[PDB]
Design a protein around this ligand. Structure first.
Ligand SMILES: O=c1[nH]c(=O)c2c([nH]1)n(C[C@@H](O)[C@@H](O)[C@H](O)CO)c(=O)n2CCCOP(=O)(O)O
Ligand SMILES: O=c1[nH]c(=O)c2c([nH]1)n(C[C@@H](O)[C@@H](O)[C@H](O)CO)c(=O)n2CCCOP(=O)(O)O
Ligand SMILES: O=c1[nH]c(=O)c2c([nH]1)n(C[C@@H](O)[C@@H](O)[C@H](O)CO)c(=O)n2CCCOP(=O)(O)O
Ligand SMILES: O=c1[nH]c(=O)c2c([nH]1)n(C[C@@H](O)[C@@H](O)[C@H](O)CO)c(=O)n2CCCOP(=O)(O)O
Ligand SMILES: O=c1[nH]c(=O)c2c([nH]1)n(C[C@@H](O)[C@H](O)[C@H](O)CO)c(=O)n2CCCOP(=O)(O)O
Ligand SMILES: O=c1[nH]c(=O)c2c([nH]1)n(C[C@@H](O)[C@H](O)[C@H](O)CO)c(=O)n2CCCOP(=O)(O)O
Ligand SMILES: O=c1[nH]c(=O)c2c([nH]1)n(C[C@H](O)[C@@H](O)[C@H](O)CO)c(=O)n2CCCOP(=O)(O)O
Ligand SMILES: O=c1[nH]c(=O)c2c([nH]1)n(C[C@H](O)[C@@H](O)[C@H](O)CO)c(=O)n2CCCOP(=O)(O)O
Ligand SMILES: O=c1[nH]c(=O)c2c([nH]1)n(C[C@H](O)[C@H](O)[C@H](O)CO)c(=O)n2CCCOP(=O)(O)O
Ligand SMILES: O=c1[nH]c(=O)c2c([nH]1)n(C[C@H](O)[C@H](O)[C@H](O)CO)c(=O)n2CCCOP(=O)(O)O
Ligand SMILES: [K+]
Ligand SMILES: [K+]
Ligand SMILES: [K+]
Ligand SMILES: [K+]
Ligand SMILES: [K+]
Ligand SMILES: [K+]
Ligand SMILES: [K+]
Ligand SMILES: [K+]
Ligand SMILES: [K+]
Ligand SMILES: [K+]
Ligand SMILES: [K+]
Ligand SMILES: [K+]
Ligand SMILES: [K+]
Ligand SMILES: [K+]
Ligand SMILES: [K+]
Ligand SMILES: [K+]
Ligand SMILES: [K+]
Ligand SMILES: [K+]
Ligand SMILES: [K+]
Ligand SMILES: [K+]
Ligand SMILES: [K+]
Ligand SMILES: [K+]
Ligand SMILES: [K+]
Ligand SMILES: [K+]
Ligand SMILES: [K+]
Lengths: 147, 146, 147, 146, 147, 147, 146, 147, 147, 146
């Protein structure tokens, strides 16, 4: 069910059509699980996600990070992806809070489209990440102090 | 090893392979005198470190189990980077062994060959449990007594 | 608008004409958003950015890092880029302040120029990074304590 | 306040007075919509902060209850110093309100008068619970939404 | 001139008439310095102040703590005052933000009234605390990174 | 019962007859509760206790601190007691481990003798502290991750 | 001592006395050949630690100057407690000497007698600057060099 | 014996003849225990001890703090003693190194002399502190990792 | 002359003949420098090294990490090596203690054998790592507080 | 730049090349009027960060010098990863510039060409010392002063 879980979702905006679709999947999983009012915040790019996730983790049980990084002509793809990976990992462990990674990292636009839960997509990593976030919050809840 | 407090956290992507790793881990534990390790499941490998962190608070050792198989994109690289960074940090923050039994393979056949099924060449779940327990016993002997 | 946010820009100096172009883009975004007088500091190379950005974060709501790293004949490109990624990421999370990454990391000079918002450039990553910094500061302000 | 996660840790020295403080705390909680706060008992006041620390990890607020009454020695001073230092540290480390309902009196009569028994002038357990809940709701409104 | 400084005021409520008087002096100082809308938060008792001050320090340049602790029949007064002192001191240094202590600690009510800036009072410590917060914030601004 | 609790006891040596009696009570409570082999370490004075307790807390579920401070002709009593209080409190919270305080702090030798569980003593604070330590370890065990 | 980077932060409560401590400190620094010390004023003694923290980032030593005189209430005690806790913390966080030239007296006569005016028995502003410089030199000698 | 332990002694200089007497006691214990060449550093006042002790703890197994604080006409005695207590305690726990407190805190000069191990002194707190430091280092060595 | 330095060696056991060869070279270096009894600890795999190195660093002036990682059929090699690198680097800096990296990371067995100081080997990285640890410990001793 | 306290730590693997980087660094420092920089040698590049950490306690800037050249195995990659992670951490922990003059090349010719010998196209030891000094001066200007 997961109805008492306090959920935040932060979604970057680069490749907005794809980002909006990941957000839609995340919000739909949340609503399906009895959460109609997750905290939803938008940032410009994937690199902006961790600092916002850090703020949200102070008062949520779980944060879903959503965005889309697609490789271009330069090495910059590598470093955007390294920053996000390093940042979200650090935020989760500093805050002892699940930070689910639904940031697509693809070689091509077609690969990102296929993973965003658009109408013809094979899958929706935004929805998947949201399941991960909720299930992990629930597990931590059962492990922690209650008596 | 009968006095050591063991936890095992196993992700669930590639479930049959995950369950096989957990079977090898549980059997090593029981053979060493531990019938009741703390066992927790998470969805994907990325979710392991935050749960391992909670478990390290009150266990002498934690075994991380899972299966990451390279797909069409670079996502594989980043999942594996996050697990590595995460487990390493948790071990040092907590001064507790966090054994890495998370398979990272290019193919399913490679993962199956490492999950200790009837035809597998090895069982990395079992190996990771031996590592966890041996390291906990080592730290026990190095630490404050008597 | 961003007229209340305190913005700092630290720009390295290797490939100076491109750095100055990035800085022009950054200042123009800042001025467009109501900020005529951002704190602007220069350093020699990209590796020198994080320690200065850390200092600026003590006193600013957002910092924009600008610079240009272009691949040469050795692996050193990789380790410069790694150091910058690692450092900017840490500084952001230690200080709970957006540190926007406008450090170009390209294979060729042509690619760097095409991303510095010169007249025939396809884009301006210095401008983009400043939008990122300011928008993230505004978001954090709304999330944080006010009455 | 029906969504706030409340914990109460109460020491046990001067048990009847401790139980009276806990009664006032529980009743405030239930009146505010919380029938099932996490409630834990410890022996003496010195033991409260380490338990409050554990509870702060997964509660929005913690109420510390207990009773320290001055005896023949300076020990009273040091028990109260440790509780004060401890609760203050835990609150700030965890960014969670830790309400102080630990009575520190010179006499038993003073403690009884503050435990919300039929003839008591006040109930510091109840007061501390109001403080905990009000502060949690305040921090909720100051923090990140929506 | 403190028009640019972001001021928060947190005031406890034990001895409410006196607390309100301190807050009145604080608000008047802020307004005189060009700040008509400081963030103002009320808490129950003085012991509740530091955790709220901690939250406010993340988003403000100065925080003013107001309240009134008067010695009763027990040693409890001493421990309330100890908690406030240790707490505000730690928050100031953790956050590198001035936390002005306008929390009255008196033996009697007459003493608290005389320090709350009512018509017949010798002084207003609410007002004094606010001057202290703002002046120290402006000092730190000068000392820190700017152009 | 408490038989799986890993217990350490550190006892200072100033006023050795009294210290030895506190240690005897602690060890007897431990044995009564099914622990025949607690880690037992001796230090010279009460000020030496916290650094040793810190080491022991790394691999025990609970530490009992035992010693005897009796006021003399100077203020030094105050500062010995402040150090021990500050140190043990910090060790408990750094290590998230109960550190039971069985350090006597008395005005007179007679008061310390009366609290050491010697034959004619009214009480034994070494035994009391050991109960506190074990009961708290057991409670934390029930609050922590088990599933 | 000419090479040491000195900062002085003085509060302003009892301004004439604070100015006298500052005069003593400045004279010592000039006597030891110091470059123009960084000098900052704050309102009250409680404001000193946070400004001393800023200054310790860029200086080899900081001298804290101020005057706290006991009044009718317990407030004196908490002002002094805050200054003591703060300065001590700042010194150890920054690994920098923070010399304490904050007078804490019962009377105005006692503070005047310690502020190094012509009829004063002592100048604690001067003393504090000597302590700051001596300690900075010692730490330089202890630390990494040729 | 203690011939392998690395000992440092930091002694303040207010009341110099008494400080030198404390230091004599410390060196004599150290030499008795096999250590002819402890690191010895002088500071001006007791308040200067903790920051120097912190430095010495990076490089030594034990540090002995020596000094003499005698009550005067004002409350300042109290705050000097508080600062020393607080600082030595923190340094010990940060560094996981025994920091022995041989700082006399007396009401009169007579009491200080009677505790400095001059010929007619009742005791020698400088010697006592060195026994404490060395014995605690040896205990910690046995508790810690060896094979 | 490293007779005074406290050396620990932690060696993993995957590729045991090669690990033993590295340890042989390490022990011979230590003995040649006047250290007949370094603390030696064995672990299973390279990933187990950093947590044990962390324990040893609390009680030693230098730690030597030995082991052998050889590339197999999967990417696992890369992550084992990443973990070792991140771990030892963090432990060195947290503990301010040299942690020498004598962990071989090769593509083939022949390469690992050639670096393990067997009769036909081009070099002994176990021996090299031990020189590195001891030399760096002696350097730090010179740089740190002494007389 | 005459007032800046400079430290240089150089590793010794490929000793002739390391000595050339050190020569360039020393020449820059002497050119900018620097007091005798603190100079320390370590064996390999991996040993640099811990010694740089010590030096950053007592200096305004540290220059890290060394030579890593790719060999037959992946070892080059992990040596460089360690140096990068370490220096970056040390700089931010100490809030001190740690300039990276550690060459990371595929060949000996590439390192020689970057070590500022007469036929060299570049001197990265010199470049690194300029970066260190320039950054120290900038931070001084940004920090607390008159
Ligand atoms: O244990 C896992 N094994 C995997 O193989 C895997 C996992 N997990 N994940 C993602 C999870 O770790 C997941 O929880 C999300 O990142 C949400 O946090 C994944 O995205 N993968 C798939 C990697 C291949 O992805 P693709 O085929 O290139 O899209
Ligand atoms: O602002 C305050 N002013 C006060 O005078 C006061 C306060 N607060 N408190 C308690 C609060 O701080 C309260 O919040 C609880 O401790 C719960 O955390 C108090 O208990 N007091 C009363 C002190 C005198 O107590 P007594 O008369 O000796 O019982
Ligand atoms: O809640 C408490 N209330 C108390 O009155 C009290 C407590 N606790 N303690 C000790 C405990 O806090 C105890 O747990 C030990 O210190 C062990 O840690 C105590 O020693 N006291 C008694 C204070 C009076 O002591 P005395 O009469 O002067 O020996
Ligand atoms: O020292 C080691 N050397 C190695 O070569 C090695 C090690 N260790 N490990 C794993 C261990 O580090 C192990 O302890 C587990 O990860 C459990 O923590 C390994 O899994 N390997 C093998 C790397 C090659 O794996 P594969 O052949 O690609 O499956
Ligand atoms: O979410 C994102 N997805 C992306 O694909 C992307 C992003 N972000 N960014 C930059 C931002 O992450 C960030 O806002 C910027 O660095 C400022 O901090 C960014 O530069 N890219 C492009 C990566 C490909 O770059 P190129 O095509 O090789 O120039
Ligand atoms: O356990 C203790 N009980 C004590 O009564 C005591 C102790 N210790 N100490 C000193 C030690 O705690 C400590 O070993 C010393 O300061 C060195 O660190 C110590 O100086 N005392 C005496 C307190 C009374 O002092 P005086 O009689 O006023 O000089
Ligand atoms: O070792 C010391 N022993 C002391 O007795 C002493 C010291 N030091 N100090 C000063 C303090 O240690 C000093 O170095 C500065 O305060 C710190 O910079 C002091 O001010 N005192 C004197 C305490 C009594 O002072 P009054 O007579 O009340 O002014
Ligand atoms: O902003 C920069 N852009 C760059 O392209 C660059 C920089 N900096 N650096 C040096 C680095 O930033 C420098 O300041 C020192 O390494 C740090 O002290 C560099 O060494 N590079 C060049 C990277 C390529 O070098 P090669 O041609 O492979 O030698
Ligand atoms: O340097 C100071 N010396 C002092 O004597 C003093 C100071 N400061 N303060 C103010 C305090 O330092 C802060 O400015 C204030 O608490 C706001 O943070 C004060 O409130 N005092 C007054 C101490 C005596 O107070 P009563 O007369 O007992 O009310
Ligand atoms: O400065 C260095 N430059 C280097 O090129 C180098 C170094 N150092 N090291 C040693 C390393 O820095 C440490 O000294 C060692 O790991 C012990 O800590 C090394 O092992 N190397 C060798 C790199 C090439 O290794 P292969 O030829 O692939 O075996
Ligand atoms: K959370
Ligand atoms: K979708
Ligand atoms: K553990
Ligand atoms: K299996
Ligand atoms: K900031
Ligand atoms: K541009
Ligand atoms: K908000
Ligand atoms: K909480
Ligand atoms: K009641
Ligand atoms: K702030
Ligand atoms: K008023
Ligand atoms: K423990
Ligand atoms: K007994
Ligand atoms: K539980
Ligand atoms: K400094
Ligand atoms: K003067
Ligand atoms: K030195
Ligand atoms: K030490
Ligand atoms: K003597
Ligand atoms: K041991
Ligand atoms: K060490
Ligand atoms: K060999
Ligand atoms: K520095
Ligand atoms: K050169
Ligand atoms: K400045």
């Amino acid at each position: 069910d997961a109805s008492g879980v306090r959920l935040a979702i932060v979604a970057s905006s680069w490749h907005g059509k794809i980002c909006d679709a990941l957000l839609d999947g995340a919000r739909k999983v949340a609503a399906g699980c009895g959460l109609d009012d997750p905290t939803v915040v938008r940032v410009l790019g994937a690199i902006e996600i961790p600092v916002v996730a850090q703020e949200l983790a102070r008062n949520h049980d779980a944060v879903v990070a959503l965005g889309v990084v697609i490789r271009g002509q330069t090495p910059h793809f590598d470093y955007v992806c390294d920053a996000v990976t390093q940042g979200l990992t650090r935020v989760s462990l500093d805050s002892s809070t699940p930070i689910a990674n639904g940031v697509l990292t693809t070689n091509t636009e077609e690969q990102a489209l296929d993973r965003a839960g658009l109408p013809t997509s094979a899958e929706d990593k935004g929805a998947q990440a949201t399941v991960a976030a909720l299930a992990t919050a629930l597990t931590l809840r059962e492990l922690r102090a209650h008596s």
